Design a protein around this motif. Sequence first.
Motif, PDB file in Angstrom:
ATOM      1  N   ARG A  90       0.801  -1.223   0.000  1.00  0.00           N
ATOM      2  CA  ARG A  90       0.000   0.000   0.000  1.00  0.00           C
ATOM      3  C   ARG A  90       0.831   1.267   0.000  1.00  0.00           C
ATOM      4  O   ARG A  90       1.997   1.282   0.384  1.00  0.00           O
ATOM      5  CB  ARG A  90      -0.926   0.027   1.217  1.00  0.00           C
ATOM      6  N   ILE A  91       0.180   2.342  -0.423  1.00  0.00           N
ATOM      7  CA  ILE A  91       0.784   3.660  -0.472  1.00  0.00           C
ATOM      8  C   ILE A  91      -0.002   4.639   0.406  1.00  0.00           C
ATOM      9  O   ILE A  91      -1.223   4.738   0.307  1.00  0.00           O
ATOM     10  CB  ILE A  91       0.811   4.213  -1.921  1.00  0.00           C
ATOM     11  N   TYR A  92       0.711   5.331   1.285  1.00  0.00           N
ATOM     12  CA  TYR A  92       0.121   6.326   2.168  1.00  0.00           C
ATOM     13  C   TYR A  92       0.743   7.665   1.860  1.00  0.00           C
ATOM     14  O   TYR A  92       1.964   7.799   1.875  1.00  0.00           O
ATOM     15  CB  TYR A  92       0.354   5.949   3.633  1.00  0.00           C
ATOM     16  N   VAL A  93      -0.090   8.653   1.571  1.00  0.00           N
ATOM     17  CA  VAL A  93       0.416   9.956   1.172  1.00  0.00           C
ATOM     18  C   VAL A  93       0.545  10.941   2.326  1.00  0.00           C
ATOM     19  O   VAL A  93      -0.302  11.006   3.211  1.00  0.00           O
ATOM     20  CB  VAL A  93      -0.503  10.567   0.088  1.00  0.00           C
ATOM     21  N   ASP A  94       1.649  11.683   2.310  1.00  0.00           N
ATOM     22  CA  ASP A  94       1.879  12.755   3.272  1.00  0.00           C
ATOM     23  C   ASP A  94       1.066  13.958   2.798  1.00  0.00           C
ATOM     24  O   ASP A  94       1.441  14.618   1.829  1.00  0.00           O
ATOM     25  CB  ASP A  94       3.374  13.115   3.305  1.00  0.00           C
ATOM     26  N   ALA A  95      -0.063  14.214   3.453  1.00  0.00           N
ATOM     27  CA  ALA A  95      -0.962  15.288   3.045  1.00  0.00           C
ATOM     28  C   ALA A  95      -0.712  16.589   3.803  1.00  0.00           C
ATOM     29  O   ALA A  95      -0.969  16.690   4.998  1.00  0.00           O
ATOM     30  CB  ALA A  95      -2.421  14.840   3.229  1.00  0.00           C
ATOM     31  N   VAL A  96      -0.210  17.584   3.080  1.00  0.00           N
ATOM     32  CA  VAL A  96       0.055  18.904   3.639  1.00  0.00           C
ATOM     33  C   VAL A  96      -1.145  19.785   3.347  1.00  0.00           C
ATOM     34  O   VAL A  96      -1.211  20.438   2.305  1.00  0.00           O
ATOM     35  CB  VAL A  96       1.325  19.503   3.001  1.00  0.00           C
ATOM     36  N   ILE A  97      -2.096  19.795   4.279  1.00  0.00           N
ATOM     37  CA  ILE A  97      -3.360  20.491   4.068  1.00  0.00           C
ATOM     38  C   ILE A  97      -3.637  21.608   5.073  1.00  0.00           C
ATOM     39  O   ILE A  97      -4.683  22.248   4.989  1.00  0.00           O
ATOM     40  CB  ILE A  97      -4.512  19.468   4.129  1.00  0.00           C
ATOM     41  N   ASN A  98      -2.733  21.854   6.013  1.00  0.00           N
ATOM     42  CA  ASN A  98      -2.968  22.913   6.990  1.00  0.00           C
ATOM     43  C   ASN A  98      -2.601  24.281   6.427  1.00  0.00           C
ATOM     44  O   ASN A  98      -3.131  25.309   6.858  1.00  0.00           O
ATOM     45  CB  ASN A  98      -2.134  22.661   8.252  1.00  0.00           C
ATOM     46  N   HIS A  99      -1.736  24.303   5.425  1.00  0.00           N
ATOM     47  CA  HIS A  99      -1.255  25.588   4.943  1.00  0.00           C
ATOM     48  C   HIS A  99      -0.691  25.510   3.539  1.00  0.00           C
ATOM     49  O   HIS A  99      -0.611  24.448   2.924  1.00  0.00           O
ATOM     50  CB  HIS A  99      -0.112  25.995   5.860  1.00  0.00           C
ATOM     51  N   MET A 100      -0.299  26.679   3.047  1.00  0.00           N
ATOM     52  CA  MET A 100       0.383  26.800   1.775  1.00  0.00           C
ATOM     53  C   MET A 100       1.846  27.182   2.072  1.00  0.00           C
ATOM     54  O   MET A 100       2.328  26.849   3.146  1.00  0.00           O
ATOM     55  CB  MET A 100      -0.312  27.834   0.878  1.00  0.00           C
ATOM     56  N   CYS A 101       2.546  27.893   1.194  1.00  0.00           N
ATOM     57  CA  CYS A 101       3.957  28.204   1.461  1.00  0.00           C
ATOM     58  C   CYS A 101       4.144  29.409   2.395  1.00  0.00           C
ATOM     59  O   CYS A 101       3.182  30.046   2.821  1.00  0.00           O
ATOM     60  CB  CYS A 101       4.687  28.457   0.144  1.00  0.00           C
ATOM     61  N   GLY A 102       5.407  29.704   2.708  1.00  0.00           N
ATOM     62  CA  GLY A 102       5.736  30.821   3.580  1.00  0.00           C
ATOM     63  C   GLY A 102       5.186  32.126   3.034  1.00  0.00           C
ATOM     64  O   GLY A 102       5.237  32.376   1.831  1.00  0.00           O
ATOM     65  N   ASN A 103       4.673  32.971   3.919  1.00  0.00           N
ATOM     66  CA  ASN A 103       4.077  34.230   3.498  1.00  0.00           C
ATOM     67  C   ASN A 103       5.105  35.198   2.922  1.00  0.00           C
ATOM     68  O   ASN A 103       4.728  36.155   2.252  1.00  0.00           O
ATOM     69  CB  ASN A 103       3.350  34.889   4.676  1.00  0.00           C
ATOM     70  N   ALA A 104       6.388  34.945   3.152  1.00  0.00           N
ATOM     71  CA  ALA A 104       7.434  35.855   2.680  1.00  0.00           C
ATOM     72  C   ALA A 104       8.066  35.411   1.357  1.00  0.00           C
ATOM     73  O   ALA A 104       8.842  36.159   0.768  1.00  0.00           O
ATOM     74  CB  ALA A 104       8.514  36.000   3.748  1.00  0.00           C
ATOM     75  N   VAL A 105       7.750  34.211   0.889  1.00  0.00           N
ATOM     76  CA  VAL A 105       8.314  33.735  -0.366  1.00  0.00           C
ATOM     77  C   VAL A 105       7.965  34.688  -1.514  1.00  0.00           C
ATOM     78  O   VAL A 105       6.861  35.224  -1.575  1.00  0.00           O
ATOM     79  CB  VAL A 105       7.803  32.304  -0.683  1.00  0.00           C
ATOM     80  N   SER A 106       8.915  34.897  -2.422  1.00  0.00           N
ATOM     81  CA  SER A 106       8.713  35.798  -3.556  1.00  0.00           C
ATOM     82  C   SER A 106       7.708  35.235  -4.553  1.00  0.00           C
ATOM     83  O   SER A 106       7.718  34.042  -4.843  1.00  0.00           O
ATOM     84  CB  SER A 106      10.041  36.045  -4.280  1.00  0.00           C
ATOM     85  N   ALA A 107       6.845  36.103  -5.075  1.00  0.00           N
ATOM     86  CA  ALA A 107       5.857  35.701  -6.068  1.00  0.00           C
ATOM     87  C   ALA A 107       6.546  35.375  -7.384  1.00  0.00           C
ATOM     88  O   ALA A 107       7.581  35.952  -7.701  1.00  0.00           O
ATOM     89  CB  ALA A 107       4.849  36.813  -6.279  1.00  0.00           C
ATOM     90  N   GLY A 108       5.979  34.453  -8.151  1.00  0.00           N
ATOM     91  CA  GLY A 108       6.590  34.080  -9.412  1.00  0.00           C
ATOM     92  C   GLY A 108       6.267  32.648  -9.778  1.00  0.00           C
ATOM     93  O   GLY A 108       5.209  32.139  -9.404  1.00  0.00           O
ATOM     94  N   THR A 109       7.172  31.993 -10.500  1.00  0.00           N
ATOM     95  CA  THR A 109       6.941  30.611 -10.909  1.00  0.00           C
ATOM     96  C   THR A 109       8.044  29.674 -10.426  1.00  0.00           C
ATOM     97  O   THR A 109       8.366  28.682 -11.091  1.00  0.00           O
ATOM     98  CB  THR A 109       6.809  30.485 -12.445  1.00  0.00           C
ATOM     99  N   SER A 110       8.635  29.991  -9.278  1.00  0.00           N
ATOM    100  CA  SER A 110       9.658  29.125  -8.715  1.00  0.00           C
ATOM    101  C   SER A 110       9.000  27.974  -7.971  1.00  0.00           C
ATOM    102  O   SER A 110       9.068  27.884  -6.746  1.00  0.00           O
ATOM    103  CB  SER A 110      10.556  29.902  -7.758  1.00  0.00           C
ATOM    104  N   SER A 111       8.340  27.113  -8.736  1.00  0.00           N
ATOM    105  CA  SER A 111       7.630  25.959  -8.204  1.00  0.00           C
ATOM    106  C   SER A 111       8.052  24.700  -8.948  1.00  0.00           C
ATOM    107  O   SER A 111       8.599  24.796 -10.044  1.00  0.00           O
ATOM    108  CB  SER A 111       6.131  26.183  -8.350  1.00  0.00           C
ATOM    109  N   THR A 112       7.767  23.526  -8.386  1.00  0.00           N
ATOM    110  CA  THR A 112       8.212  22.282  -8.999  1.00  0.00           C
ATOM    111  C   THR A 112       7.715  22.077 -10.436  1.00  0.00           C
ATOM    112  O   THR A 112       8.135  21.125 -11.090  1.00  0.00           O
ATOM    113  CB  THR A 112       7.976  21.068  -8.080  1.00  0.00           C
ATOM    114  N   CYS A 113       6.801  22.910 -10.928  1.00  0.00           N
ATOM    115  CA  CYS A 113       6.501  22.847 -12.363  1.00  0.00           C
ATOM    116  C   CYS A 113       5.743  24.041 -12.878  1.00  0.00           C
ATOM    117  O   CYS A 113       4.653  23.929 -13.427  1.00  0.00           O
ATOM    118  CB  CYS A 113       5.865  21.550 -12.878  1.00  0.00           C
ATOM    119  N   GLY A 114       6.378  25.193 -12.699  1.00  0.00           N
ATOM    120  CA  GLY A 114       5.879  26.449 -13.214  1.00  0.00           C
ATOM    121  C   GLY A 114       4.594  27.090 -12.779  1.00  0.00           C
ATOM    122  O   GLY A 114       4.258  28.139 -13.310  1.00  0.00           O
ATOM    123  N   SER A 115       3.861  26.499 -11.849  1.00  0.00           N
ATOM    124  CA  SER A 115       2.637  27.140 -11.418  1.00  0.00           C
ATOM    125  C   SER A 115       2.948  28.501 -10.829  1.00  0.00           C
ATOM    126  O   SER A 115       3.883  28.641 -10.039  1.00  0.00           O
ATOM    127  CB  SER A 115       1.925  26.296 -10.367  1.00  0.00           C
TER     128      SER A 115
END
Length: 496
Positions: free
Chosen positions: A92-117
């Motif tokens: 079986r596969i169990y997923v680590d679900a990160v659902i309490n939050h999004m990224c740091g509030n100070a991170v720079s806006a842009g497309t520095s994400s694992t696939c351009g979002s």
Amino acid sequence: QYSPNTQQGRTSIVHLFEWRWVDIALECERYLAPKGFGGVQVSPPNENVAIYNPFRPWWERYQPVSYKLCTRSGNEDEFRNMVTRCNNVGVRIYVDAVINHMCGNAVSAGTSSTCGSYFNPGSRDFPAVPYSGWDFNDGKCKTGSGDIENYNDATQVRDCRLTGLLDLALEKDYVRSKIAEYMNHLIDIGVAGFRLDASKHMWPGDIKAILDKLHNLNSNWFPAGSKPFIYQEVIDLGGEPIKSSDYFGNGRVTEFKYGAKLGTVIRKWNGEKMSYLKNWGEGWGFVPSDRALVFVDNHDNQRGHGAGGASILTFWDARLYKMAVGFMLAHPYGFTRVMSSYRWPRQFQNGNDVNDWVGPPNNNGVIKEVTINPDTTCGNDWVCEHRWRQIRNMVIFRNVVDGQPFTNWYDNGSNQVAFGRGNRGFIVFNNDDWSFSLTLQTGLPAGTYCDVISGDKINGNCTGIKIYVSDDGKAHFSISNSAEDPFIAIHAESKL
Ligand SMILES: C[C@H]1O[C@H](O[C@H]2[C@H](O)[C@@H](O)[C@@H](O)O[C@@H]2CO)[C@H](O)[C@@H](O)[C@@H]1N[C@H]1C=C(CO)[C@@H](O[C@H]2O[C@H](CO)[C@@H](O[C@H]3O[C@H](CO)[C@@H](O)[C@H](O)[C@H]3O)[C@H](O)[C@H]2O)[C@H](O)[C@H]1O
Ligand SMILES: *[C@@H]1O[C@H](CO)[C@@H](O)[C@H](O)[C@H]1NC(C)=O
Ligand SMILES: [Ca+2]
Ligand SMILES: [Cl-]
């Protein structure tokens, strides 16, 4: 939510921390299935922020940008392929679900994400979900900094930002629905359950509301009516207003007191002794066994990021670690999780490791493949503790004695103890600075058994130590304090 949904006869899951999907897929087929492993906990499969300062740290994966299955571990096709192949072999596969939050509030806006979002933390804009400003708890948090400042205030712990991570307004049906949409996508792909990251930072009622929106497991692999296995990460070591029991209605909970206390007793800190483990379990103030997910170390505290402190045992302390992991899977308490890590350049300065951020082995950010050596160990800096003979054989030991009671306990009043599991298994430990040589009652049927710690049973023979059990179940055990592994374990399937 309390049942692991593992194949009958498999009692443990392994955390293949930062492993790529293709590597996990063949690991399921080449090792996990035949060695009796119940399942795999994978790193967050959703898109996260790409942090270059420091360079690609492991924790960048705990800063979501969207729910697209697109990370350094692989894409959605690779992820689906892994789940299908693993399920097809009963792992079986169990997923680590990160659902309490999004990224740091100070991170720079842009497309520095694992696939351009594209994403803009400053304006609370996450178009790829989509999430906007009124989907966060900015107006709900009551602290001056906006971050969690005091764990003695149960309200701010849930409504404010954990180390600046934008806190999702989990009371909103819209937000609850977007998270359920993500988890149901995974469930329909074939995942058997989830680790709820930062559960302490979410209201038990909000979590329940989300779980109520989840589908039953995929009917192509699981029986009708199957519910996803849920284990909530709640660090409760005893001194805060929030208790792990508050989450019993949603599923199991991580029992962090387990590894912390085990490390102290095995290290023999502050006068602790292995003889004190006779009443290990609820007797030590732990949560009920049927609500506990146990482990010796996790991805956080093996590098000083969680709770447990300096007492936590890890692969770095190989000899004592094998003993700790061995005691854990021999003991009936809880559902066991074995850790699998990677090597990093630990640099201790003033008692603290300055390289605790270093991510998985890589080449220019690209995670390295897990290579297997002729002796079955791993290369490319992967530790693969799950492949160590002493650990792998104890994983099987737990399967073999599943359901058997704790009995025939023995201790010398110090650090030499032993106990059995019904009439299917027996384990002996020597953690004293002197030899152990004594005849003990094992409760096992007469015969010759292979010690599964020093060797294996291959071709009707043992490659390591051999134990001889008489008609009355007695057997002589000899363990020198100089042994490379000061403990012996034998079971029904190691019988010759
Ligand atoms: C790491 C854990 O922190 C908390 O634990 C607290 C206990 O609850 C409390 O009782 C007491 O003992 O203190 C500890 C430490 O504060 C949470 O309760 C627990 O959930 C958490 N573990 C899990 C969750 C997080 C968050 O998703 C994970 O943290 C890792 O990832 C974050 C994000 O990248 C990283 O933080 C870094 O980024 C932020 C961005 O704003 C920076 O502000 C911060 O300086 C960076 O370091 C964390 O350091 C990292 O641990 C964790 O992996 C999960 O297991
Ligand atoms: C076990 O090993 C011995 C040699 O040490 C050999 O004589 C014997 O045939 C082996 N048993 C089996 C069943 O292969
Ligand atoms: Ca929260
Ligand atoms: Cl955890």
